[PDB]
CSV table of C-alpha atoms and ligand atoms in Angstrom, one decimal:
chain,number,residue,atom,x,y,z
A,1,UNK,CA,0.0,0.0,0.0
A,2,UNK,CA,3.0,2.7,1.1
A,3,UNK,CA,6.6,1.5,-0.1
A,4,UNK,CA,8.3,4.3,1.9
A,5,UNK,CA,9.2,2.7,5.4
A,6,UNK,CA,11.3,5.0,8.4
A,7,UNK,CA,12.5,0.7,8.3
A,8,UNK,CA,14.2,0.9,4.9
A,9,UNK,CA,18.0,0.3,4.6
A,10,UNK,CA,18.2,3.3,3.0
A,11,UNK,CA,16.2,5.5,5.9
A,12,UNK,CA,18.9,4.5,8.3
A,13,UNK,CA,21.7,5.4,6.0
A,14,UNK,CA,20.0,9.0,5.1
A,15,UNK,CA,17.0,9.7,6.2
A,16,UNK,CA,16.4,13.2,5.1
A,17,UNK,CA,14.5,12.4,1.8
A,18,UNK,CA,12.3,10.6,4.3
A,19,UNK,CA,11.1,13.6,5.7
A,20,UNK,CA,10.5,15.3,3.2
A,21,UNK,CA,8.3,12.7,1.4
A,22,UNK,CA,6.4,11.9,4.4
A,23,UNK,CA,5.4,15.3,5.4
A,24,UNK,CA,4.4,16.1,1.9
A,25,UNK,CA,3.0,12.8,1.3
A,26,UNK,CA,1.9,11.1,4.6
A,27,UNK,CA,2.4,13.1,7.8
A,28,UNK,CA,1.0,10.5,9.5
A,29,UNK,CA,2.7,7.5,8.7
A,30,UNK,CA,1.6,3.8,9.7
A,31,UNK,CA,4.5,1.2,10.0
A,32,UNK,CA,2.8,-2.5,10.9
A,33,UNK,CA,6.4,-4.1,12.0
A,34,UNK,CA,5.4,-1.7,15.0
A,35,UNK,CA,2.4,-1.0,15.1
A,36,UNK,CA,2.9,3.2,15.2
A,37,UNK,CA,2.5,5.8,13.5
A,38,UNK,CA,5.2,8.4,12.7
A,39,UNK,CA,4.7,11.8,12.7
A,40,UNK,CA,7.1,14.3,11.0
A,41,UNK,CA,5.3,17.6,10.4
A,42,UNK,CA,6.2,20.5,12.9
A,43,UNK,CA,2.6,21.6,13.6
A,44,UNK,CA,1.7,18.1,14.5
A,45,UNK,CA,4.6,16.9,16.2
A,46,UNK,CA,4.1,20.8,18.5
A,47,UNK,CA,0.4,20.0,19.0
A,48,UNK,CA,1.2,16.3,20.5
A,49,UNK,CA,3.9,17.1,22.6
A,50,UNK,CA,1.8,20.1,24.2
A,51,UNK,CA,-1.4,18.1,24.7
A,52,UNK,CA,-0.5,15.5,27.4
A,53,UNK,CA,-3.7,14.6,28.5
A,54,UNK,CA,-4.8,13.5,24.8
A,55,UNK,CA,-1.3,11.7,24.0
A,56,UNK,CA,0.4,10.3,27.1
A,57,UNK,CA,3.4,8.8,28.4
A,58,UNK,CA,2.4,5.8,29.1
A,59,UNK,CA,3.9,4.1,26.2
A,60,UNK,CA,7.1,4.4,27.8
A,61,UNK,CA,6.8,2.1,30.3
A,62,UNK,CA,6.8,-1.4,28.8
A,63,UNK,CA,9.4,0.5,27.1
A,64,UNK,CA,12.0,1.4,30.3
A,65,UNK,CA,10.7,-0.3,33.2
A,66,UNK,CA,12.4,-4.0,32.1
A,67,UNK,CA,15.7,-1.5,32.8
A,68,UNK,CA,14.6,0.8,35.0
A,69,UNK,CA,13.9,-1.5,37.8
A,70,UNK,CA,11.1,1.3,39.3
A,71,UNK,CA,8.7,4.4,37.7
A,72,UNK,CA,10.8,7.3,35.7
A,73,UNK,CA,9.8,10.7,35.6
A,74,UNK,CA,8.3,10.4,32.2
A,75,UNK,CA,5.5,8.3,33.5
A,76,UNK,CA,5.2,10.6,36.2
A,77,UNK,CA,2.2,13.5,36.0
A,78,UNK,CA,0.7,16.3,38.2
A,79,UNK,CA,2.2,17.6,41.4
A,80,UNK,CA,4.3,14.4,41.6
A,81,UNK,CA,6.0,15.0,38.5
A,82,UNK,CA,6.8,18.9,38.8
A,83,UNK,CA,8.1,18.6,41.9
A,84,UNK,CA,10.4,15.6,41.4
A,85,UNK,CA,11.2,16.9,38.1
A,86,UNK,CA,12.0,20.7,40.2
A,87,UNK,CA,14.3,18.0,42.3
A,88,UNK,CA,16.4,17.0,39.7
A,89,UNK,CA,16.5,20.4,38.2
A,90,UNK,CA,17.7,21.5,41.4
A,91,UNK,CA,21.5,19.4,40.9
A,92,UNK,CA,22.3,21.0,38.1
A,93,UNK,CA,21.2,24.8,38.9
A,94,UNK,CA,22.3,27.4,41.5
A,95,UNK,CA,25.2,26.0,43.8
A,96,UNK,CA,25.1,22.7,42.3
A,97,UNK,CA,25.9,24.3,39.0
A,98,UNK,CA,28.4,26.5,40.3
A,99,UNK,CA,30.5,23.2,41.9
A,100,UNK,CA,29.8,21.3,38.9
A,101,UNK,CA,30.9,23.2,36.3
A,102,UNK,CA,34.9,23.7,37.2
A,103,UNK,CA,34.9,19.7,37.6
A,104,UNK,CA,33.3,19.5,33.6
A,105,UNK,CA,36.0,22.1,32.9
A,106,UNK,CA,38.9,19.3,34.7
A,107,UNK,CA,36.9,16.4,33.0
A,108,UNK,CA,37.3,18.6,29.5
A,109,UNK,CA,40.8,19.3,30.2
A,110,UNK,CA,42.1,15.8,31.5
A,111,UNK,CA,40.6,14.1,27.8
A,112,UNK,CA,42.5,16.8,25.7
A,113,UNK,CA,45.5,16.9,27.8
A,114,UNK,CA,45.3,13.1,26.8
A,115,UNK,CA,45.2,13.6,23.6
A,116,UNK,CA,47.2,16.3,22.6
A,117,UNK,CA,50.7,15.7,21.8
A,118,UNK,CA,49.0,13.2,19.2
A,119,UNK,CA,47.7,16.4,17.3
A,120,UNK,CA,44.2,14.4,16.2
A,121,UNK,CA,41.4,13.5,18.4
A,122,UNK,CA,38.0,11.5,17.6
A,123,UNK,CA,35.0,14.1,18.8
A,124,UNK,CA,32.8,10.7,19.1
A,125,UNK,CA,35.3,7.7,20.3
A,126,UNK,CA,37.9,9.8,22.3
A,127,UNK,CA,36.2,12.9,23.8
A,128,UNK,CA,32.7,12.5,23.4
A,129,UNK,CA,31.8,8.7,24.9
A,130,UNK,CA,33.9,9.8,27.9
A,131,UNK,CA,33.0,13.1,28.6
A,132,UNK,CA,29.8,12.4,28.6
A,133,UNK,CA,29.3,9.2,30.6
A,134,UNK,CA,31.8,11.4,33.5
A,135,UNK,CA,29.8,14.6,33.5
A,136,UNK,CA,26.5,12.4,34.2
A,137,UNK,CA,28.7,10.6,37.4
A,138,UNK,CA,29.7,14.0,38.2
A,139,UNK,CA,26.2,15.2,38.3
A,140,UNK,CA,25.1,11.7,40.1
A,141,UNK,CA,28.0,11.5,42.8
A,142,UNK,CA,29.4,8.8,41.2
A,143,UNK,CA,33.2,8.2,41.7
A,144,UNK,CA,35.2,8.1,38.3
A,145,UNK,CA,36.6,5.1,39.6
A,146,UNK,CA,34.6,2.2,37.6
A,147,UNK,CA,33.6,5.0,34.3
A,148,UNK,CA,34.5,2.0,31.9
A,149,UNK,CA,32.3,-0.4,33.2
A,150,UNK,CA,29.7,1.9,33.5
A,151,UNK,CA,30.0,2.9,29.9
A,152,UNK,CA,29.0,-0.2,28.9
A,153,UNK,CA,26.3,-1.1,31.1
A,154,UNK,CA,24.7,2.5,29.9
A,155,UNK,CA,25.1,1.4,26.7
A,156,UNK,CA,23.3,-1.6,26.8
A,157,UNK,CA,20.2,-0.1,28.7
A,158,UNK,CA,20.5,2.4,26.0
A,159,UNK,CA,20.1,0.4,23.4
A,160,UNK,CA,17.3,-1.5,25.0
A,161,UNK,CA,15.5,1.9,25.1
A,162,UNK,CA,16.2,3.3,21.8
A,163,UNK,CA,15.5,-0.3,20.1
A,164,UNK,CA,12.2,-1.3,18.2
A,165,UNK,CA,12.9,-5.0,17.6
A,166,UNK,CA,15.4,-6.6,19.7
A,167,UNK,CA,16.1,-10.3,19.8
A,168,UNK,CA,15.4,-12.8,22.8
A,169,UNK,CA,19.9,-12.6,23.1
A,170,UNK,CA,20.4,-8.7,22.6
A,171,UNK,CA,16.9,-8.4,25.4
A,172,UNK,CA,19.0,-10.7,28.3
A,173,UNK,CA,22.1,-8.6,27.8
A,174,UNK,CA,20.2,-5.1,28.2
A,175,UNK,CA,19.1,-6.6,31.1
A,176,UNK,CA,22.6,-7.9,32.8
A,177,UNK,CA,23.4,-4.4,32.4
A,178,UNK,CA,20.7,-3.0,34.2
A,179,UNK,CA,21.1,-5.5,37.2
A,180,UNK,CA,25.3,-5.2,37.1
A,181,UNK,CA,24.5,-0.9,37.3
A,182,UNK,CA,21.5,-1.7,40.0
A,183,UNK,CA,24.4,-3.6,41.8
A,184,UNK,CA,26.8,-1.4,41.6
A,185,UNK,CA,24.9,1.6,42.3
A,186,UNK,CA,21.8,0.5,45.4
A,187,UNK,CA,25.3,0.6,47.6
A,188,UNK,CA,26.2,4.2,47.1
A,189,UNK,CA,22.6,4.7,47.8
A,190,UNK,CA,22.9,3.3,50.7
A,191,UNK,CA,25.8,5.2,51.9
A,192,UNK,CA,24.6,8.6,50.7
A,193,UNK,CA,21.9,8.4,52.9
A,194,UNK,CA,24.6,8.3,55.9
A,195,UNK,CA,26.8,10.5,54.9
A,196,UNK,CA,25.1,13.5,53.0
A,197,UNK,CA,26.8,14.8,49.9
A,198,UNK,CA,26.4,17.9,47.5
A,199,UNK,CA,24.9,15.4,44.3
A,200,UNK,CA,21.9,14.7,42.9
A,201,UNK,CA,21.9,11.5,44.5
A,202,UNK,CA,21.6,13.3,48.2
A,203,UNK,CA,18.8,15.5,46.5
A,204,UNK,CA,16.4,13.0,45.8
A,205,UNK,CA,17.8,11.0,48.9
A,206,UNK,CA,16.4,13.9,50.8
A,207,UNK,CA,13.5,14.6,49.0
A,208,UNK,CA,10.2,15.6,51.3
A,209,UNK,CA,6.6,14.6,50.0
A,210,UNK,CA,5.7,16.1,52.5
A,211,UNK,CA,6.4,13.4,55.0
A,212,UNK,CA,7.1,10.4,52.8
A,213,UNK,CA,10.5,9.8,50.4
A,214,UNK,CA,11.2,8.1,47.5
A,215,UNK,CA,12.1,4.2,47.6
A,216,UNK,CA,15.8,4.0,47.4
A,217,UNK,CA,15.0,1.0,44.2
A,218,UNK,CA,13.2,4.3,42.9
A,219,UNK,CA,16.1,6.4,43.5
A,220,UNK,CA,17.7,4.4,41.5
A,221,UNK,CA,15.2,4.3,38.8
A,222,UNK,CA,15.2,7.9,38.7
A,223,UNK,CA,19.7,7.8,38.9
A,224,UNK,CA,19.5,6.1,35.9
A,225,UNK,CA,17.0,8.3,34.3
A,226,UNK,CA,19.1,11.0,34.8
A,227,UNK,CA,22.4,8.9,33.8
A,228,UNK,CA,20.7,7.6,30.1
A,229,UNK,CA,19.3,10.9,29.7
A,230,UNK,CA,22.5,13.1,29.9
A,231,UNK,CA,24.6,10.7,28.2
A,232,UNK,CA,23.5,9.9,24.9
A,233,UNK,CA,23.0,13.2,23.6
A,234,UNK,CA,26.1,14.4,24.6
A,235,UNK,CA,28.3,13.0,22.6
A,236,UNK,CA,26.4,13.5,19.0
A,237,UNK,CA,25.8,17.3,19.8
A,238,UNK,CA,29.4,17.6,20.4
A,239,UNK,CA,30.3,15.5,16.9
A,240,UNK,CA,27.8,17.5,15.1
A,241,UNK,CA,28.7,20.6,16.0
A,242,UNK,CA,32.5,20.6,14.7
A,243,UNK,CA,32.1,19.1,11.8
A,244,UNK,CA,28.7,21.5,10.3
A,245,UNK,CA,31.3,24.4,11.5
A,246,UNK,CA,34.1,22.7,10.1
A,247,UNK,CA,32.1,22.3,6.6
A,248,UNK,CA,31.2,25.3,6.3
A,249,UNK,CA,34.2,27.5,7.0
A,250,UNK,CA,33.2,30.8,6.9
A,251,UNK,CA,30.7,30.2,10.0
A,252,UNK,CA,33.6,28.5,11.6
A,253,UNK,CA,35.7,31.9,11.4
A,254,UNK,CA,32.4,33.9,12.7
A,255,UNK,CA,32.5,31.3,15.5
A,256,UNK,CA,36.4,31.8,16.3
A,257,UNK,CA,35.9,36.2,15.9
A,258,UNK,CA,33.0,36.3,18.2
A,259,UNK,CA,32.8,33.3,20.8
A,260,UNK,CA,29.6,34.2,21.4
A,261,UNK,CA,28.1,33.0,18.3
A,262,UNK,CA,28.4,29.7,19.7
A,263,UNK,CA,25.5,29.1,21.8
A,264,UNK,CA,23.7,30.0,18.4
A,265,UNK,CA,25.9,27.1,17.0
A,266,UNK,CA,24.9,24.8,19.2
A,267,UNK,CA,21.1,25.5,19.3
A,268,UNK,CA,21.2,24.6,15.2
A,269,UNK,CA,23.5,22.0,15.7
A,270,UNK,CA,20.5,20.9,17.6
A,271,UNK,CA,17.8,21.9,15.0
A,272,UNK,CA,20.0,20.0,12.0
A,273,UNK,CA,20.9,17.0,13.7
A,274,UNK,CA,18.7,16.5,15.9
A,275,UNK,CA,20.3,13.5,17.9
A,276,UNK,CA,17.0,12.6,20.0
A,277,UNK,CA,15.0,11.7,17.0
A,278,UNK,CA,11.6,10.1,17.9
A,279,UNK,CA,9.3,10.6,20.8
A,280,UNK,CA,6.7,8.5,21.3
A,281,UNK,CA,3.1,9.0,22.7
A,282,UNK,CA,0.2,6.9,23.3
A,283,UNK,CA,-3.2,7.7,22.1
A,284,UNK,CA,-6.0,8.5,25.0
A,285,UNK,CA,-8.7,8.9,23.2
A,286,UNK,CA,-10.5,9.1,19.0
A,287,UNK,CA,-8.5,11.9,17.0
A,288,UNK,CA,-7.6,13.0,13.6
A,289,UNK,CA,-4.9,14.7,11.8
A,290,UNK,CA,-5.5,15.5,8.2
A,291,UNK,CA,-7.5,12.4,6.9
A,292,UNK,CA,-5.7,9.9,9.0
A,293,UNK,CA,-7.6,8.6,12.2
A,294,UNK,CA,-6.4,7.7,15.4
A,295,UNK,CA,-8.0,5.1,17.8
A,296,UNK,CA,-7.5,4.9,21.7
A,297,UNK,CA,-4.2,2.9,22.6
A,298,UNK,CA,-2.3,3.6,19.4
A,299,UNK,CA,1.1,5.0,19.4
A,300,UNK,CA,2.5,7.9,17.5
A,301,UNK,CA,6.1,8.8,16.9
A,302,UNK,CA,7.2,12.2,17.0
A,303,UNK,CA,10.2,12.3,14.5
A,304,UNK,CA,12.1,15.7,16.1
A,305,UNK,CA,14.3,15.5,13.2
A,306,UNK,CA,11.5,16.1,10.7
A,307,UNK,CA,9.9,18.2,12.5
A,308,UNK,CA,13.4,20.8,12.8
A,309,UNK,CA,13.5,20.4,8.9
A,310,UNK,CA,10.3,21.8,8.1
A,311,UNK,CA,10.2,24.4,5.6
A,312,UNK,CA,6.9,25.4,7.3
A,313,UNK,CA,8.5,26.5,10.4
A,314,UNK,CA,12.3,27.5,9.0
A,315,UNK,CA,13.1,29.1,5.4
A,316,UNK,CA,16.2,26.5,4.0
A,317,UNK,CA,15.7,24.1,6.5
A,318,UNK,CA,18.0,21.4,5.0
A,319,UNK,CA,20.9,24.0,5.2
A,320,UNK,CA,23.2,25.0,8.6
A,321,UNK,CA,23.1,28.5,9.0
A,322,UNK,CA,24.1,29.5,12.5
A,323,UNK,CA,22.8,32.9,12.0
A,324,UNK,CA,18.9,31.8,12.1
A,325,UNK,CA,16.7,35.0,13.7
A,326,UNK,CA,13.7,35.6,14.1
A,327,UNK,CA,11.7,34.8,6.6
A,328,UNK,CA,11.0,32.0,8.9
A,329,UNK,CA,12.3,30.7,11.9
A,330,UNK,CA,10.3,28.6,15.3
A,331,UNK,CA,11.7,27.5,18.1
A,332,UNK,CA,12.9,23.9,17.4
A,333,UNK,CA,11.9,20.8,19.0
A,334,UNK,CA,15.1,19.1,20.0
A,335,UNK,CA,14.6,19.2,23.8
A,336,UNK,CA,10.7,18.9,23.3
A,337,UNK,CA,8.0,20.7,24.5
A,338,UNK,CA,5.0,20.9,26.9
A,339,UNK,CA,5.0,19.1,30.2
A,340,UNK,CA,7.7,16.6,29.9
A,341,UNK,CA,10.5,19.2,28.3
A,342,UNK,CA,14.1,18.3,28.9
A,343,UNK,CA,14.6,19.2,32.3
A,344,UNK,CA,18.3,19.4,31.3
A,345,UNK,CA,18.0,21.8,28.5
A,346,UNK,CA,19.6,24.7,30.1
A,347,UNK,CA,22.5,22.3,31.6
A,348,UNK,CA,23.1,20.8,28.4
A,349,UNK,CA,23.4,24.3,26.6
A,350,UNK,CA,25.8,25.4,29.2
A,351,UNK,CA,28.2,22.3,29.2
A,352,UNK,CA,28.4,22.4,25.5
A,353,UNK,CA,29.6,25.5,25.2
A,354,UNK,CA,32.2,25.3,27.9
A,355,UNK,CA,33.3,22.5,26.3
A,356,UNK,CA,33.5,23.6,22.7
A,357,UNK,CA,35.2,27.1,23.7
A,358,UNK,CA,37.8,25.1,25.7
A,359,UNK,CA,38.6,22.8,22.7
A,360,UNK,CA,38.8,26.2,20.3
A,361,UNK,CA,40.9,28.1,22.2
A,362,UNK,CA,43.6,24.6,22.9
A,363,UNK,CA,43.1,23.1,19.7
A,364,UNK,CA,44.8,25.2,17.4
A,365,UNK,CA,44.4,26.1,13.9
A,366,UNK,CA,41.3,22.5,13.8
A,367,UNK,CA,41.7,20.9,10.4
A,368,UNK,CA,39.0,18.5,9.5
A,369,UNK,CA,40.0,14.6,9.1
A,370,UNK,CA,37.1,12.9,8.9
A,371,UNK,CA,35.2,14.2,5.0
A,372,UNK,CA,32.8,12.5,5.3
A,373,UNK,CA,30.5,11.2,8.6
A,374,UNK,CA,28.4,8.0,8.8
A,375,UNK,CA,25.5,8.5,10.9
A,376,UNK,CA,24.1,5.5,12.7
A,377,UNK,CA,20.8,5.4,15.0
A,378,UNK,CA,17.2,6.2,14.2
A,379,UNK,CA,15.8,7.1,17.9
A,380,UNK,CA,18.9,8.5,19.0
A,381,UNK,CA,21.8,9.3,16.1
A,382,UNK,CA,25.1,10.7,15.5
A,383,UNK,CA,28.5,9.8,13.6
A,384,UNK,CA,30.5,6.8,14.1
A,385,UNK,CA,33.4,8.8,14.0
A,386,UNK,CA,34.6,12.6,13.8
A,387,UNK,CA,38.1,13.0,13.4
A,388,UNK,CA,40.0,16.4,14.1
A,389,UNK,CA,43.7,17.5,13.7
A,390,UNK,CA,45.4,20.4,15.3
A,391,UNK,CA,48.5,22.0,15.8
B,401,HEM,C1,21.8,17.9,24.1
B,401,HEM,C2,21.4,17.3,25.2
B,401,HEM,C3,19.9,16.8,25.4
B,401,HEM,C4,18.9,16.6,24.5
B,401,HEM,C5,19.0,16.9,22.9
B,401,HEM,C6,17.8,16.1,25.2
B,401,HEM,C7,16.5,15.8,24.6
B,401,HEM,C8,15.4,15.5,25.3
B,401,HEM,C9,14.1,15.4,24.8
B,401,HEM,C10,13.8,15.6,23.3
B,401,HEM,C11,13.2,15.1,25.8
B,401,HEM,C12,11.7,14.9,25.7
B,401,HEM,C13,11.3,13.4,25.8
B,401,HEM,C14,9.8,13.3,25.8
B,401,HEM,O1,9.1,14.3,25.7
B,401,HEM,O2,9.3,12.1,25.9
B,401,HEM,C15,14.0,15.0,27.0
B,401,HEM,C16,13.6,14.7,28.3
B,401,HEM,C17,14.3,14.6,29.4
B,401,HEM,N1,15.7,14.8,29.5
B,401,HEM,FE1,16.9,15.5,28.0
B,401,HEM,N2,18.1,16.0,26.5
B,401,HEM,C18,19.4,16.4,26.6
B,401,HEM,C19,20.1,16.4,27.8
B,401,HEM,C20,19.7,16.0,29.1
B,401,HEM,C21,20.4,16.2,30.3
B,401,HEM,C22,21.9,16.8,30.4
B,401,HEM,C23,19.7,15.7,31.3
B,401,HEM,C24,20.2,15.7,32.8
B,401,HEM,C25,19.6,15.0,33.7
B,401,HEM,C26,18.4,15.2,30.7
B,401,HEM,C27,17.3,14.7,31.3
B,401,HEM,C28,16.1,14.6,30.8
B,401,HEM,C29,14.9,14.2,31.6
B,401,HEM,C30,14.8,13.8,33.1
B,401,HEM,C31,13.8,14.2,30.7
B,401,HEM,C32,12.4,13.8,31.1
B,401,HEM,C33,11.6,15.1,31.2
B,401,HEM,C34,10.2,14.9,31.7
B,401,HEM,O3,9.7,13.8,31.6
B,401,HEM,O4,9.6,15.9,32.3
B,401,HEM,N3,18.5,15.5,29.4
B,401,HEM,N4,15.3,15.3,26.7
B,402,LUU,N1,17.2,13.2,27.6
B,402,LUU,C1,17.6,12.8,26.2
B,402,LUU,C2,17.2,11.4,25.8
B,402,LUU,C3,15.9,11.2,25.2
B,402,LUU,C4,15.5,9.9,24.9
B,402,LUU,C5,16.4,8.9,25.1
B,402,LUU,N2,16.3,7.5,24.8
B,402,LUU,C6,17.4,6.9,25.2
B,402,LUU,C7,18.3,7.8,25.7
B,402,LUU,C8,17.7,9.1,25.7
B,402,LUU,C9,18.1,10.4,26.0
């Protein structure tokens, strides 16, 4: 009936002639294999995410809890959920930030100081993947001691999360990882709750429903909320960023004259390559978009990367222009919008720009190695590989 499918070889590989057939064509796109529908247009994909009583979280939830061990935020709602949300918020704002963000700047410098006598370093494989697995322990509490390990059991809870057909060997791995991080980590639990520290992990260890606190197996569920959630995007954004700069040289050089061009960088590094690329909802109730219909319990798939791309909400959208203002420009969707928003938005615009101005101004004279990227991922995506020399 439809031969385009988001499961094509060829969507994988390059998926941008995907959007723009299917919000031409069929903005609301039905793939059996899943039983979903995906939706790329910006007004559509704006109008789910901000009504959360008609399209719910519930979906993830089969989707998380195998790894999760106990309820994440998403599938939190009401006062529960603001507040808790407010409490994780709260590690990575006021004095929490201001501890933090020297430690980032030691994490940043201890990778590069690695690294540079070398005069090449891999964005992805030797900065990225580290930086961003530390800063999340950093945020936790988590000693850098075991970081390795705990790269690889994130990795495989990851890619039970971001996975759409997983087989019966690739599920009971995911799940190893899950139990060798709950082991690891319902300890330190344990011992925060002594001896109080300036982390996350104390935060939510002291939180106050007004008499009542959060289990410490939910604790952990919301730890490793926080620990998937500030990982993963990390290390695309950063990959992304240098090399649309580095491809288009002239914005590079605005970058270099005025730093502050760079939070501008970032924010359509973040519209372009959007590296959280679907967000799923589950249908409450009968609805329509256009002429296709909806029924109660279906699932629709935001695709954020679509939606960034459309020509209704930017002018060129296919084209990386760091000097976007607002023929047509929208705020994009890369953190998402309405009540469950990434609560680490602001963070995560912060650290990548500390982190990109340090590797300018030690880096010197960046050369691009890598021509060309290979981008791997449909949920989340970024380059294998992104390969820089310098001075
Ligand atoms: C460039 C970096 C990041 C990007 C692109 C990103 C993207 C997103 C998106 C698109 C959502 C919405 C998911 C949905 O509506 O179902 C989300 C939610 C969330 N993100 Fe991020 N995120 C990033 C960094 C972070 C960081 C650093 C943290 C730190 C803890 C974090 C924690 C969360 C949490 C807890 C949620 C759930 C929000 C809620 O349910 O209210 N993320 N993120
Ligand atoms: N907070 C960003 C984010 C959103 C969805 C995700 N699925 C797996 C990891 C991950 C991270």
């Amino acid at each position: 009936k439809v031969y385009n499918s988001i499961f094509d070889q060829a969507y994988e590989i390059d998926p941008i002639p995907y959007f723009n057939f299917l919000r031409k064509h069929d903005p609301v796109h039905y793939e059996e294999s899943i039983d979903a529908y995906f939706v790329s247009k910006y007004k559509d994909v704006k109008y789910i995410l901000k009504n959360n009583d008609i399209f719910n979280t519930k979906t993830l939830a089969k989707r998380a809890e195998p790894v999760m061990k106990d309820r994440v935020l998403a599938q939190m709602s009401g006062q529960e959920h603001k507040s808790k949300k407010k409490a994780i918020l709260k590690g990575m704002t006021g004095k929490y930030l201001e501890n933090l963000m020297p430690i980032l700047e030691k994490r940043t410098n201890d990778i590069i100081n690695k690294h540079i006598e070398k005069k090449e370093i891999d964005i992805v494989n030797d900065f990225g993947k580290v930086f961003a697995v530390q800063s999340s322990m950093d945020l936790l509490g988590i000693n850098l001691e075991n970081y390795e390990k705990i790269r690889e059991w994130h990795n495989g809870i990851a890619k039970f999360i971001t996975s759409f057909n997983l087989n019966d060997e690739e599920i009971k791995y995911s799940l190893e990882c899950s139990d060798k991080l709950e082991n690891y980590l319902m300890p330190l639990i344990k011992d925060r709750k002594k001896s109080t520290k300036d982390d996350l992990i104390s935060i939510l260890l002291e939180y106050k429903n007004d008499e009542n606190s959060i289990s410490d197996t939910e604790i952990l569920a919301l730890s490793l909320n926080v620990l998937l959630a500030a990982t993963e995007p990390v290390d695309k954004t950063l990959a992304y960023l240098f090399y649309n700069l580095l491809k288009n040289p002239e914005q590079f050089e605005s970058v270099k004259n005025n730093p502050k061009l760079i939070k501008n960088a970032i924010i359509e590094t973040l519209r372009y390559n959007s590296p959280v690329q679907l967000i799923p909802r589950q249908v409450s109730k009968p609805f329509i978009f256009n002429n296709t219909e909806l029924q109660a319990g279906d699932t629709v798939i935001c695709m954020i990367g679509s939606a960034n791309r459309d020509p209704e909400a930017y002018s060129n959208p296919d084209e990386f222009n760091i000097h976007r203002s607002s023929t047509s420009h929208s705020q994009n969707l890369s953190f998402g919008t309405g009540v469950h928003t990434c609560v680490g938005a602001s963070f995560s615009l912060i650290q990548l720009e500390m982190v990109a101005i340090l590797l300018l101004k030690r880096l010197k004279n960046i050369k691009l190695k890598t021509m060309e990227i290979t981008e791997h991922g449909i949920y989340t995506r970024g380059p294998k590989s992104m390969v820089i020399s310098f001075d």
